[PDB]
Amino acid sequence: NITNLCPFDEVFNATRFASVYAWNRKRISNCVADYSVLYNLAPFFTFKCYGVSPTKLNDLCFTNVYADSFVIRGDEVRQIAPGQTGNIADYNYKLPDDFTGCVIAWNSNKLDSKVSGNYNYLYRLFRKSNLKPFERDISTEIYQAGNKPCNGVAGFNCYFPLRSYSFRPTYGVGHQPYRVVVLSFELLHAPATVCGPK
Amino acid sequence: QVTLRESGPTLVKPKQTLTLTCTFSGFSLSTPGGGVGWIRQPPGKALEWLALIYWDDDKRYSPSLKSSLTITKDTSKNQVVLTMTNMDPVDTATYYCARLTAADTIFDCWGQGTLVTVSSAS
Amino acid sequence: ALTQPASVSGSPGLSITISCTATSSDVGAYNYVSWYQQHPGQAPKLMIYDVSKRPSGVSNRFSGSKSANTASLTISGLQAEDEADYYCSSYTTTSVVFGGGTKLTVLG
């Protein structure tokens, strides 16, 4: 008994979407969530829920929904699945192997790819240990290998952790930008706050 | 209702700097994916892209000309300014400013274009 | 760059095609390509953006195709008010190429 629409237009229709290592999080609560509205927007070529039954989802209440958003490449969308190796599922954004949520990834090469490359999306490349479930590495320190100390320079054995995606419109499907929004549903023992139309 | 009107002096002395401006009305340049560029068209020749600006102050230029082309935005008054130095008597052409709505729609709406000539005559 | 046929003739009503070959293929996947029309004395007007798409205000007489790496503008049902210069433009790895020109001569 809430009778209020959730602000899904703030995580699916935002001007500045997110970064890879600085993925945005907008927790939703105390509102009615009708996921069918997602079928009227741009064609979502990737809608793979993991334990959520995407079809007939309006008839399901949720306790705490966490909507995370970021932008990745094309061949790296398959790493947002719960449990996978690679480069962004180990040092940028990793999901637990209990993820009862939905990953919606849509191609954004129409507005997130400019001439000579869009360098406004950075992804982490060098990190000591693998990223733990739901950890955001907002820090950027010079990755000094544990052999010889380094300083604020760049050389043969000393480099920078973050890299720069080059989203050019002359790239085929796989290197084009893709906006990915993951909805994590708690569904634990607690009074629910987000339900559907019923 | 997109309207892109060019301005600036048509006649320019050789070896100087242009001040070709483009007033755009009917859209906001802050839209994600938008942008205003410039296309040169010599008399009796083909089109050639010169410069381009985006919604995040990103300035792209042609790889052949990067030491003279300078584009800037003045969204406070909706006026994109383009300045190029070292005007040679080969740049006499009809300059256009077209809006780049998105990456898929390359320069959909064009302006009217101004004939900029480079001649030592009065 | 992009090469186009210089002169193209067409009888009133028949269908013609304009080839946009990407010689020196640094164009990449060649995903986006837009065809503009320019009448003598006016500004280039976009006829058809990406090969399967049509802007509001253009009739179904214009269509686009791309067999393997060559864009083709199919114009069917020619009229007297169609003799204009057509330009195909795509994206390169570092610039925005605009190709050459193509003059349509509707005899009669």
PDB file of N, CA and C in Angstrom, chain A residues 20-103:
ATOM      1  N   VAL A  20      33.315   3.056 -15.289  1.00  0.00           N
ATOM      2  CA  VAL A  20      33.463   1.617 -15.089  1.00  0.00           C
ATOM      3  C   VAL A  20      33.839   1.316 -13.643  1.00  0.00           C
ATOM      4  N   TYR A  21      34.898   1.956 -13.147  1.00  0.00           N
ATOM      5  CA  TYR A  21      35.349   1.746 -11.778  1.00  0.00           C
ATOM      6  C   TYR A  21      34.576   2.580 -10.765  1.00  0.00           C
ATOM      7  N   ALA A  22      33.801   3.563 -11.219  1.00  0.00           N
ATOM      8  CA  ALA A  22      33.023   4.408 -10.324  1.00  0.00           C
ATOM      9  C   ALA A  22      31.539   4.258 -10.631  1.00  0.00           C
ATOM     10  N   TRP A  23      31.091   3.012 -10.785  1.00  0.00           N
ATOM     11  CA  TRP A  23      29.698   2.729 -11.106  1.00  0.00           C
ATOM     12  C   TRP A  23      28.764   3.378 -10.094  1.00  0.00           C
ATOM     13  N   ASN A  24      27.682   3.965 -10.596  1.00  0.00           N
ATOM     14  CA  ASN A  24      26.759   4.684  -9.732  1.00  0.00           C
ATOM     15  C   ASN A  24      25.747   3.729  -9.114  1.00  0.00           C
ATOM     16  N   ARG A  25      25.268   4.090  -7.925  1.00  0.00           N
ATOM     17  CA  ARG A  25      24.304   3.283  -7.185  1.00  0.00           C
ATOM     18  C   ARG A  25      23.176   4.183  -6.708  1.00  0.00           C
ATOM     19  N   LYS A  26      21.942   3.837  -7.074  1.00  0.00           N
ATOM     20  CA  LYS A  26      20.751   4.595  -6.691  1.00  0.00           C
ATOM     21  C   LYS A  26      19.755   3.602  -6.100  1.00  0.00           C
ATOM     22  N   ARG A  27      19.790   3.447  -4.780  1.00  0.00           N
ATOM     23  CA  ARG A  27      18.878   2.532  -4.109  1.00  0.00           C
ATOM     24  C   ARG A  27      17.450   3.058  -4.176  1.00  0.00           C
ATOM     25  N   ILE A  28      16.511   2.167  -4.487  1.00  0.00           N
ATOM     26  CA  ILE A  28      15.103   2.519  -4.608  1.00  0.00           C
ATOM     27  C   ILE A  28      14.351   1.910  -3.433  1.00  0.00           C
ATOM     28  N   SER A  29      13.340   2.626  -2.945  1.00  0.00           N
ATOM     29  CA  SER A  29      12.571   2.158  -1.801  1.00  0.00           C
ATOM     30  C   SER A  29      11.264   2.933  -1.721  1.00  0.00           C
ATOM     31  N   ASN A  30      10.231   2.256  -1.216  1.00  0.00           N
ATOM     32  CA  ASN A  30       8.913   2.847  -0.985  1.00  0.00           C
ATOM     33  C   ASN A  30       8.327   3.423  -2.277  1.00  0.00           C
ATOM     34  N   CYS A  31       8.098   2.531  -3.239  1.00  0.00           N
ATOM     35  CA  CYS A  31       7.514   2.912  -4.518  1.00  0.00           C
ATOM     36  C   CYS A  31       7.091   1.651  -5.257  1.00  0.00           C
ATOM     37  N   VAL A  32       6.207   1.832  -6.233  1.00  0.00           N
ATOM     38  CA  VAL A  32       5.725   0.736  -7.067  1.00  0.00           C
ATOM     39  C   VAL A  32       6.588   0.659  -8.318  1.00  0.00           C
ATOM     40  N   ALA A  33       7.097  -0.534  -8.614  1.00  0.00           N
ATOM     41  CA  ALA A  33       8.006  -0.754  -9.734  1.00  0.00           C
ATOM     42  C   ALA A  33       7.308  -1.622 -10.773  1.00  0.00           C
ATOM     43  N   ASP A  34       7.008  -1.036 -11.927  1.00  0.00           N
ATOM     44  CA  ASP A  34       6.406  -1.746 -13.053  1.00  0.00           C
ATOM     45  C   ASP A  34       7.480  -1.900 -14.125  1.00  0.00           C
ATOM     46  N   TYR A  35       8.065  -3.096 -14.206  1.00  0.00           N
ATOM     47  CA  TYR A  35       9.174  -3.337 -15.121  1.00  0.00           C
ATOM     48  C   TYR A  35       8.743  -3.398 -16.580  1.00  0.00           C
ATOM     49  N   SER A  36       7.440  -3.493 -16.857  1.00  0.00           N
ATOM     50  CA  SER A  36       6.981  -3.529 -18.242  1.00  0.00           C
ATOM     51  C   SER A  36       7.328  -2.243 -18.980  1.00  0.00           C
ATOM     52  N   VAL A  37       7.488  -1.136 -18.248  1.00  0.00           N
ATOM     53  CA  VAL A  37       7.893   0.123 -18.866  1.00  0.00           C
ATOM     54  C   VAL A  37       9.260  -0.015 -19.521  1.00  0.00           C
ATOM     55  N   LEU A  38      10.078  -0.958 -19.049  1.00  0.00           N
ATOM     56  CA  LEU A  38      11.376  -1.193 -19.668  1.00  0.00           C
ATOM     57  C   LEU A  38      11.254  -1.751 -21.080  1.00  0.00           C
ATOM     58  N   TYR A  39      10.103  -2.323 -21.434  1.00  0.00           N
ATOM     59  CA  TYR A  39       9.912  -2.859 -22.775  1.00  0.00           C
ATOM     60  C   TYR A  39       9.472  -1.804 -23.779  1.00  0.00           C
ATOM     61  N   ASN A  40       9.119  -0.602 -23.322  1.00  0.00           N
ATOM     62  CA  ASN A  40       8.733   0.484 -24.212  1.00  0.00           C
ATOM     63  C   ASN A  40       9.894   1.404 -24.565  1.00  0.00           C
ATOM     64  N   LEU A  41      10.994   1.337 -23.821  1.00  0.00           N
ATOM     65  CA  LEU A  41      12.164   2.163 -24.084  1.00  0.00           C
ATOM     66  C   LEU A  41      12.972   1.540 -25.224  1.00  0.00           C
ATOM     67  N   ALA A  42      14.208   2.011 -25.407  1.00  0.00           N
ATOM     68  CA  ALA A  42      15.124   1.520 -26.433  1.00  0.00           C
ATOM     69  C   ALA A  42      15.251   0.002 -26.369  1.00  0.00           C
ATOM     70  N   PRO A  43      15.515  -0.663 -27.494  1.00  0.00           N
ATOM     71  CA  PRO A  43      15.613  -2.132 -27.484  1.00  0.00           C
ATOM     72  C   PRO A  43      16.736  -2.612 -26.578  1.00  0.00           C
ATOM     73  N   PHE A  44      16.358  -3.325 -25.518  1.00  0.00           N
ATOM     74  CA  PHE A  44      17.316  -3.882 -24.564  1.00  0.00           C
ATOM     75  C   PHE A  44      17.710  -5.268 -25.053  1.00  0.00           C
ATOM     76  N   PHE A  45      18.818  -5.331 -25.793  1.00  0.00           N
ATOM     77  CA  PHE A  45      19.280  -6.588 -26.367  1.00  0.00           C
ATOM     78  C   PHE A  45      19.751  -7.586 -25.318  1.00  0.00           C
ATOM     79  N   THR A  46      19.941  -7.159 -24.071  1.00  0.00           N
ATOM     80  CA  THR A  46      20.440  -8.027 -23.006  1.00  0.00           C
ATOM     81  C   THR A  46      19.563  -7.834 -21.774  1.00  0.00           C
ATOM     82  N   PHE A  47      18.670  -8.791 -21.526  1.00  0.00           N
ATOM     83  CA  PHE A  47      17.815  -8.808 -20.340  1.00  0.00           C
ATOM     84  C   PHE A  47      17.854 -10.234 -19.800  1.00  0.00           C
ATOM     85  N   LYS A  48      18.819 -10.513 -18.929  1.00  0.00           N
ATOM     86  CA  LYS A  48      19.021 -11.851 -18.378  1.00  0.00           C
ATOM     87  C   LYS A  48      18.948 -11.771 -16.857  1.00  0.00           C
ATOM     88  N   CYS A  49      17.777 -12.065 -16.303  1.00  0.00           N
ATOM     89  CA  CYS A  49      17.626 -12.137 -14.859  1.00  0.00           C
ATOM     90  C   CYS A  49      18.154 -13.466 -14.340  1.00  0.00           C
ATOM     91  N   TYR A  50      18.745 -13.426 -13.152  1.00  0.00           N
ATOM     92  CA  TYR A  50      19.331 -14.602 -12.515  1.00  0.00           C
ATOM     93  C   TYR A  50      18.514 -14.914 -11.265  1.00  0.00           C
ATOM     94  N   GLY A  51      17.477 -15.728 -11.438  1.00  0.00           N
ATOM     95  CA  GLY A  51      16.600 -16.087 -10.344  1.00  0.00           C
ATOM     96  C   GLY A  51      15.463 -15.127 -10.093  1.00  0.00           C
ATOM     97  N   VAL A  52      15.107 -14.297 -11.071  1.00  0.00           N
ATOM     98  CA  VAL A  52      14.076 -13.282 -10.890  1.00  0.00           C
ATOM     99  C   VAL A  52      12.877 -13.479 -11.803  1.00  0.00           C
ATOM    100  N   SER A  53      12.962 -14.362 -12.807  1.00  0.00           N
ATOM    101  CA  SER A  53      11.868 -14.608 -13.743  1.00  0.00           C
ATOM    102  C   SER A  53      11.403 -13.305 -14.388  1.00  0.00           C
ATOM    103  N   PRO A  54      12.164 -12.766 -15.348  1.00  0.00           N
ATOM    104  CA  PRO A  54      11.814 -11.456 -15.930  1.00  0.00           C
ATOM    105  C   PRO A  54      10.377 -11.352 -16.412  1.00  0.00           C
ATOM    106  N   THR A  55       9.878 -12.360 -17.120  1.00  0.00           N
ATOM    107  CA  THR A  55       8.475 -12.371 -17.500  1.00  0.00           C
ATOM    108  C   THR A  55       7.600 -12.541 -16.263  1.00  0.00           C
ATOM    109  N   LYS A  56       6.497 -11.794 -16.223  1.00  0.00           N
ATOM    110  CA  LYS A  56       5.590 -11.780 -15.074  1.00  0.00           C
ATOM    111  C   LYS A  56       6.337 -11.418 -13.792  1.00  0.00           C
ATOM    112  N   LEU A  57       7.035 -10.283 -13.832  1.00  0.00           N
ATOM    113  CA  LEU A  57       7.764  -9.775 -12.679  1.00  0.00           C
ATOM    114  C   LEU A  57       6.999  -8.698 -11.921  1.00  0.00           C
ATOM    115  N   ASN A  58       5.961  -8.120 -12.529  1.00  0.00           N
ATOM    116  CA  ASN A  58       5.186  -7.085 -11.854  1.00  0.00           C
ATOM    117  C   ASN A  58       4.501  -7.620 -10.605  1.00  0.00           C
ATOM    118  N   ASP A  59       4.215  -8.916 -10.564  1.00  0.00           N
ATOM    119  CA  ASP A  59       3.582  -9.536  -9.401  1.00  0.00           C
ATOM    120  C   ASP A  59       4.638 -10.143  -8.479  1.00  0.00           C
ATOM    121  N   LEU A  60       5.482  -9.269  -7.933  1.00  0.00           N
ATOM    122  CA  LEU A  60       6.540  -9.700  -7.021  1.00  0.00           C
ATOM    123  C   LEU A  60       7.007  -8.496  -6.222  1.00  0.00           C
ATOM    124  N   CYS A  61       6.867  -8.562  -4.901  1.00  0.00           N
ATOM    125  CA  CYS A  61       7.354  -7.500  -4.037  1.00  0.00           C
ATOM    126  C   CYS A  61       8.844  -7.678  -3.759  1.00  0.00           C
ATOM    127  N   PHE A  62       9.495  -6.574  -3.401  1.00  0.00           N
ATOM    128  CA  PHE A  62      10.910  -6.586  -3.065  1.00  0.00           C
ATOM    129  C   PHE A  62      11.141  -5.711  -1.843  1.00  0.00           C
ATOM    130  N   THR A  63      12.158  -6.070  -1.060  1.00  0.00           N
ATOM    131  CA  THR A  63      12.459  -5.361   0.180  1.00  0.00           C
ATOM    132  C   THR A  63      13.368  -4.158  -0.063  1.00  0.00           C
ATOM    133  N   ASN A  64      14.561  -4.398  -0.602  1.00  0.00           N
ATOM    134  CA  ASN A  64      15.524  -3.335  -0.877  1.00  0.00           C
ATOM    135  C   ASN A  64      16.131  -3.589  -2.249  1.00  0.00           C
ATOM    136  N   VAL A  65      15.813  -2.728  -3.211  1.00  0.00           N
ATOM    137  CA  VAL A  65      16.328  -2.835  -4.570  1.00  0.00           C
ATOM    138  C   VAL A  65      17.468  -1.841  -4.740  1.00  0.00           C
ATOM    139  N   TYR A  66      18.612  -2.337  -5.206  1.00  0.00           N
ATOM    140  CA  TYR A  66      19.788  -1.517  -5.464  1.00  0.00           C
ATOM    141  C   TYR A  66      20.045  -1.499  -6.963  1.00  0.00           C
ATOM    142  N   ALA A  67      19.988  -0.314  -7.560  1.00  0.00           N
ATOM    143  CA  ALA A  67      20.183  -0.148  -8.995  1.00  0.00           C
ATOM    144  C   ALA A  67      21.568   0.440  -9.235  1.00  0.00           C
ATOM    145  N   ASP A  68      22.472  -0.374  -9.767  1.00  0.00           N
ATOM    146  CA  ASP A  68      23.803   0.076 -10.134  1.00  0.00           C
ATOM    147  C   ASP A  68      23.878   0.267 -11.642  1.00  0.00           C
ATOM    148  N   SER A  69      24.676   1.242 -12.062  1.00  0.00           N
ATOM    149  CA  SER A  69      24.776   1.604 -13.468  1.00  0.00           C
ATOM    150  C   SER A  69      26.226   1.880 -13.829  1.00  0.00           C
ATOM    151  N   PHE A  70      26.608   1.477 -15.041  1.00  0.00           N
ATOM    152  CA  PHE A  70      27.942   1.742 -15.570  1.00  0.00           C
ATOM    153  C   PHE A  70      27.915   1.537 -17.081  1.00  0.00           C
ATOM    154  N   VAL A  71      29.074   1.721 -17.712  1.00  0.00           N
ATOM    155  CA  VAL A  71      29.233   1.572 -19.155  1.00  0.00           C
ATOM    156  C   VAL A  71      30.488   0.752 -19.416  1.00  0.00           C
ATOM    157  N   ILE A  72      30.361  -0.289 -20.237  1.00  0.00           N
ATOM    158  CA  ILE A  72      31.467  -1.180 -20.559  1.00  0.00           C
ATOM    159  C   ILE A  72      31.507  -1.388 -22.069  1.00  0.00           C
ATOM    160  N   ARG A  73      32.405  -2.264 -22.514  1.00  0.00           N
ATOM    161  CA  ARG A  73      32.505  -2.594 -23.929  1.00  0.00           C
ATOM    162  C   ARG A  73      31.426  -3.610 -24.297  1.00  0.00           C
ATOM    163  N   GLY A  74      31.529  -4.178 -25.496  1.00  0.00           N
ATOM    164  CA  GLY A  74      30.547  -5.132 -25.968  1.00  0.00           C
ATOM    165  C   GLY A  74      30.860  -6.560 -25.576  1.00  0.00           C
ATOM    166  N   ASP A  75      32.084  -7.008 -25.853  1.00  0.00           N
ATOM    167  CA  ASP A  75      32.483  -8.364 -25.499  1.00  0.00           C
ATOM    168  C   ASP A  75      32.688  -8.549 -24.004  1.00  0.00           C
ATOM    169  N   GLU A  76      32.589  -7.483 -23.214  1.00  0.00           N
ATOM    170  CA  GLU A  76      32.725  -7.561 -21.768  1.00  0.00           C
ATOM    171  C   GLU A  76      31.383  -7.560 -21.049  1.00  0.00           C
ATOM    172  N   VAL A  77      30.272  -7.552 -21.788  1.00  0.00           N
ATOM    173  CA  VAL A  77      28.961  -7.622 -21.153  1.00  0.00           C
ATOM    174  C   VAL A  77      28.743  -8.990 -20.525  1.00  0.00           C
ATOM    175  N   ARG A  78      29.299 -10.042 -21.128  1.00  0.00           N
ATOM    176  CA  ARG A  78      29.132 -11.392 -20.607  1.00  0.00           C
ATOM    177  C   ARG A  78      29.843 -11.612 -19.279  1.00  0.00           C
ATOM    178  N   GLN A  79      30.604 -10.633 -18.795  1.00  0.00           N
ATOM    179  CA  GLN A  79      31.288 -10.750 -17.515  1.00  0.00           C
ATOM    180  C   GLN A  79      30.453 -10.246 -16.346  1.00  0.00           C
ATOM    181  N   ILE A  80      29.331  -9.572 -16.613  1.00  0.00           N
ATOM    182  CA  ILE A  80      28.443  -9.124 -15.542  1.00  0.00           C
ATOM    183  C   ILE A  80      27.604 -10.260 -14.982  1.00  0.00           C
ATOM    184  N   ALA A  81      27.624 -11.428 -15.621  1.00  0.00           N
ATOM    185  CA  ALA A  81      26.942 -12.588 -15.076  1.00  0.00           C
ATOM    186  C   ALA A  81      27.531 -12.944 -13.711  1.00  0.00           C
ATOM    187  N   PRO A  82      26.734 -13.530 -12.816  1.00  0.00           N
ATOM    188  CA  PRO A  82      27.247 -13.829 -11.475  1.00  0.00           C
ATOM    189  C   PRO A  82      28.286 -14.936 -11.502  1.00  0.00           C
ATOM    190  N   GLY A  83      29.552 -14.553 -11.370  1.00  0.00           N
ATOM    191  CA  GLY A  83      30.645 -15.501 -11.369  1.00  0.00           C
ATOM    192  C   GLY A  83      31.245 -15.656 -12.748  1.00  0.00           C
ATOM    193  N   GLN A  84      32.396 -15.031 -12.974  1.00  0.00           N
ATOM    194  CA  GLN A  84      33.068 -15.041 -14.267  1.00  0.00           C
ATOM    195  C   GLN A  84      34.446 -14.423 -14.102  1.00  0.00           C
ATOM    196  N   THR A  85      35.390 -14.904 -14.902  1.00  0.00           N
ATOM    197  CA  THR A  85      36.734 -14.351 -14.923  1.00  0.00           C
ATOM    198  C   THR A  85      36.781 -13.189 -15.915  1.00  0.00           C
ATOM    199  N   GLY A  86      37.982 -12.702 -16.211  1.00  0.00           N
ATOM    200  CA  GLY A  86      38.131 -11.607 -17.148  1.00  0.00           C
ATOM    201  C   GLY A  86      38.925 -10.449 -16.586  1.00  0.00           C
ATOM    202  N   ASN A  87      38.499  -9.233 -16.883  1.00  0.00           N
ATOM    203  CA  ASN A  87      39.208  -8.048 -16.415  1.00  0.00           C
ATOM    204  C   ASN A  87      38.315  -7.084 -15.648  1.00  0.00           C
ATOM    205  N   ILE A  88      37.049  -6.944 -16.041  1.00  0.00           N
ATOM    206  CA  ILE A  88      36.141  -6.064 -15.315  1.00  0.00           C
ATOM    207  C   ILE A  88      35.359  -6.801 -14.234  1.00  0.00           C
ATOM    208  N   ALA A  89      35.266  -8.125 -14.316  1.00  0.00           N
ATOM    209  CA  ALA A  89      34.627  -8.930 -13.287  1.00  0.00           C
ATOM    210  C   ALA A  89      35.595  -9.343 -12.190  1.00  0.00           C
ATOM    211  N   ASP A  90      36.822  -8.826 -12.216  1.00  0.00           N
ATOM    212  CA  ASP A  90      37.822  -9.138 -11.206  1.00  0.00           C
ATOM    213  C   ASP A  90      38.484  -7.916 -10.593  1.00  0.00           C
ATOM    214  N   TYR A  91      38.491  -6.770 -11.273  1.00  0.00           N
ATOM    215  CA  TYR A  91      39.111  -5.572 -10.730  1.00  0.00           C
ATOM    216  C   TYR A  91      38.277  -4.312 -10.911  1.00  0.00           C
ATOM    217  N   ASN A  92      37.119  -4.388 -11.564  1.00  0.00           N
ATOM    218  CA  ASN A  92      36.263  -3.225 -11.761  1.00  0.00           C
ATOM    219  C   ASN A  92      34.899  -3.379 -11.108  1.00  0.00           C
ATOM    220  N   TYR A  93      34.180  -4.462 -11.398  1.00  0.00           N
ATOM    221  CA  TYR A  93      32.846  -4.660 -10.832  1.00  0.00           C
ATOM    222  C   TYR A  93      32.536  -6.149 -10.857  1.00  0.00           C
ATOM    223  N   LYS A  94      32.428  -6.757  -9.679  1.00  0.00           N
ATOM    224  CA  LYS A  94      32.178  -8.185  -9.551  1.00  0.00           C
ATOM    225  C   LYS A  94      30.891  -8.416  -8.775  1.00  0.00           C
ATOM    226  N   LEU A  95      30.099  -9.384  -9.235  1.00  0.00           N
ATOM    227  CA  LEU A  95      28.848  -9.756  -8.601  1.00  0.00           C
ATOM    228  C   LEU A  95      29.004 -11.075  -7.858  1.00  0.00           C
ATOM    229  N   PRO A  96      28.337 -11.243  -6.719  1.00  0.00           N
ATOM    230  CA  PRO A  96      28.423 -12.516  -5.996  1.00  0.00           C
ATOM    231  C   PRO A  96      27.719 -13.624  -6.760  1.00  0.00           C
ATOM    232  N   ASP A  97      28.003 -14.862  -6.362  1.00  0.00           N
ATOM    233  CA  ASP A  97      27.282 -16.000  -6.928  1.00  0.00           C
ATOM    234  C   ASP A  97      26.020 -16.308  -6.143  1.00  0.00           C
ATOM    235  N   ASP A  98      25.264 -15.261  -5.807  1.00  0.00           N
ATOM    236  CA  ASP A  98      23.919 -15.381  -5.262  1.00  0.00           C
ATOM    237  C   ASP A  98      23.023 -14.280  -5.818  1.00  0.00           C
ATOM    238  N   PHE A  99      23.438 -13.641  -6.908  1.00  0.00           N
ATOM    239  CA  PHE A  99      22.829 -12.408  -7.395  1.00  0.00           C
ATOM    240  C   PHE A  99      21.409 -12.690  -7.865  1.00  0.00           C
ATOM    241  N   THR A 100      20.435 -12.293  -7.055  1.00  0.00           N
ATOM    242  CA  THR A 100      19.023 -12.413  -7.416  1.00  0.00           C
ATOM    243  C   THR A 100      18.516 -11.088  -7.981  1.00  0.00           C
ATOM    244  N   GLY A 101      19.115 -10.692  -9.100  1.00  0.00           N
ATOM    245  CA  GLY A 101      18.756  -9.450  -9.753  1.00  0.00           C
ATOM    246  C   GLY A 101      18.750  -9.580 -11.260  1.00  0.00           C
ATOM    247  N   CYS A 102      18.568  -8.466 -11.961  1.00  0.00           N
ATOM    248  CA  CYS A 102      18.478  -8.466 -13.416  1.00  0.00           C
ATOM    249  C   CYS A 102      19.507  -7.506 -13.991  1.00  0.00           C
ATOM    250  N   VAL A 103      20.232  -7.955 -15.009  1.00  0.00           N
ATOM    251  CA  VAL A 103      21.203  -7.123 -15.710  1.00  0.00           C
ATOM    252  C   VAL A 103      20.605  -6.723 -17.052  1.00  0.00           C
TER     253      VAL A 103
END
